[PDB]
Design a protein around this nucleic acid. Sequence first.
RNA 1: ACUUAAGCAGUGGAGCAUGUUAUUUAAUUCUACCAUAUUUUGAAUAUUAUAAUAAUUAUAAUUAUUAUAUUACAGGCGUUACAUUGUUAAUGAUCCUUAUAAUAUGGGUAAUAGACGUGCUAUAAUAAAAUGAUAAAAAACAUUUUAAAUAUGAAAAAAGAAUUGCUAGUAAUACGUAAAUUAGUAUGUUACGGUGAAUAUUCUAACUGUUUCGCACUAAUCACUCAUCACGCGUUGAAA
RNA 2: AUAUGAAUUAAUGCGAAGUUGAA
Length: 493
Amino acid sequence: ELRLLSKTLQGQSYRDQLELNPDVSKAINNNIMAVHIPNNLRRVATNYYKEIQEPNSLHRPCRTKMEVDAHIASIFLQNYGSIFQSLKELQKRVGPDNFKPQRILDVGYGPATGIVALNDILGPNYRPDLKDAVILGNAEMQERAKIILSRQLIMTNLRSSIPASKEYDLIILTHQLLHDGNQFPIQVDENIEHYLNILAPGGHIVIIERGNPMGFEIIARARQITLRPENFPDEFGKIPRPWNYFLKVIAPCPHQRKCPLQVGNPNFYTHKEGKDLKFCNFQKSIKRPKFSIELKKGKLLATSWDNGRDYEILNYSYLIFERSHKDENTLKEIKKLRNENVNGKYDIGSLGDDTQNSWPRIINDPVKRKGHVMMDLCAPSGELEKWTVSRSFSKQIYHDARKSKKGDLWASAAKTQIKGLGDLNVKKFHKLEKERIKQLKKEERQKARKAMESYNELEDSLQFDDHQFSNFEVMKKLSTFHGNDFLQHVNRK
RNA sequence: ACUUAAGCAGUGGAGCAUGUUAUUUAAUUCUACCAUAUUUUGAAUAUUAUAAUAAUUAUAAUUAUUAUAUUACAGGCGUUACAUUGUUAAUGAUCCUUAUAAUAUGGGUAAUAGACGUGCUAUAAUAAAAUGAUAAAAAACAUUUUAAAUAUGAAAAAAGAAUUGCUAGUAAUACGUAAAUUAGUAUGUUACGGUGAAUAUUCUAACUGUUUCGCACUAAUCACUCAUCACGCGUUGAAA
RNA sequence: AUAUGAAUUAAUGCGAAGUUGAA
Ligand code: SF4
């Protein structure tokens, strides 16, 4: 626990090692797995892992009870850390006082997972009115969710579908903005819109995803459709955005403008040219409990599939929105803020409003050498930035930057604040796609003359009938002519 | 059909070794890190000048060299969320230039509540110790002694989860030899030979692919369909 | 009887996101 500076404290993110409640670990390893002989649980967990090892895949509901317990094993470990960190980010950014939500909803394939994390977070003295929690996967998951929640302090209401006769002030989503690899662009909009309807005034939505390029794509698309950066050009900073309804981003994003890292299609992470592309992931460390230690052992699961750790480094992407309060106050407040005080063109190097909301976020592990720390930042201006701190520019700023880590908000000035030039090829890619759209319309027009001259050549020497073109090849042209015709037909659809 | 049950061979609580994590720290780097002093064209190339040296022209002019200044800069174990080549360091781009460069001293990389992996040695008598034939790229044989926390071990005894392999020149060997990294270090890896067993498979079995049936499922059983509970809007039917 | 209106009243159609059963 370092002195650093008071501002550096608010800037820093929760870096402590993660741990499950010992009661919960004892409960799981005593009941949920002791009856099961470990081999079958390991087999079903391995099955679950193998079908996500595929590039840019998505997680799936747990079909059968053995897969149910295997999901309790493998993914509770990861999702608990993800939610715990994201909720800590939320609590700290909004302040510890504003976060006393009464109406609580959690959606995810796992057990009541946001519920347990929230309980552990704000402590065992917390007894709201409502603690609804839907479990998508299986009925057998709810009894084990009850088992887990019993050891903590039940009022949690285990459902199977979203109750839609009530609004909520706190909502958590885990792996819910998509369910199919295909249909990716649009299911995110449908799913998010489904939940934004049931977010009460002043509430918060906390979305957590896998943290691989597909997941980053999901968060980026959700942010784009919700904020709509293009609808408010030249508007820097964070003012709530429409979607009598208004929403703003709490974290990780430090700007409401477009995401600099967004490339539209996940599949292009799979190409040779996409071998250096980068995405807004976020790592954390959590120490393995007994069962994982007992579980992740054997040739099947504890070897190179072809030394051990006490902990897992989990990747996840996440997003948060804060909702404004329905009132004669907030609406006019937002309207006037958008009218009379634009926050100007925040320059590269700027710190935004110089409050925790608009601080640059450290989106890569800072690289540290003698005297100087360099940082890769998503800036409140919104461009990728390399900021270098030195012993020269100061001693204290160097001290703080030299303890800086990924996922922290850096909150000071630097001697150089240049653009993050490297792997900004997403901006080069934004050119390529727009090239295609304009030149796509040349493609059909080229294809017209390409096929016309081919057939005009055909008819000349087939009307003249010298038949220099072979019977095999001539009938090949006719195949191309009609085949090209049909392919144009369906492309209209 | 792994695996299990059996039989056999074992290993598994102790320590260290070797790492990792955490916590701690001014650092506990990823000599490269911390504290205190201390150097600013520095390491090179060029410019432009005053000093000597030469060569010329004519003391001066020029050219060099050599110093001293001279600033472009040099320098950077800075960057790959800095690229392209090259390979399995370079160019470029950018960043620092009383500092991110340079030197010195000391300190750290070895801190220790914990936690986990990898191996070696132990815990005695179908087995250790002392003494006396054979390889490829010494165990063996012989004799004797041998306590009961020792004369074992260089805490460790009793019981457990776990786990490794199962006819084979395989396992195991308190059997050794050798190579590379190396100025020096191996309990790590690699090969390389010598000796050469035990023991038998009722059983269970996920996963598992074929499959058979039905389907009203087609995002595929969390599938779809049906009924309930509420809100409004209609349509028609009787009517004192 | 052929119509036209009616307090009172029967059934059913639709749709909004859902709520409840497991036919
Ligand atoms: S790069 Fe910045 S804007 Fe994009 S998702 Fe990450 S934090 Fe948000």
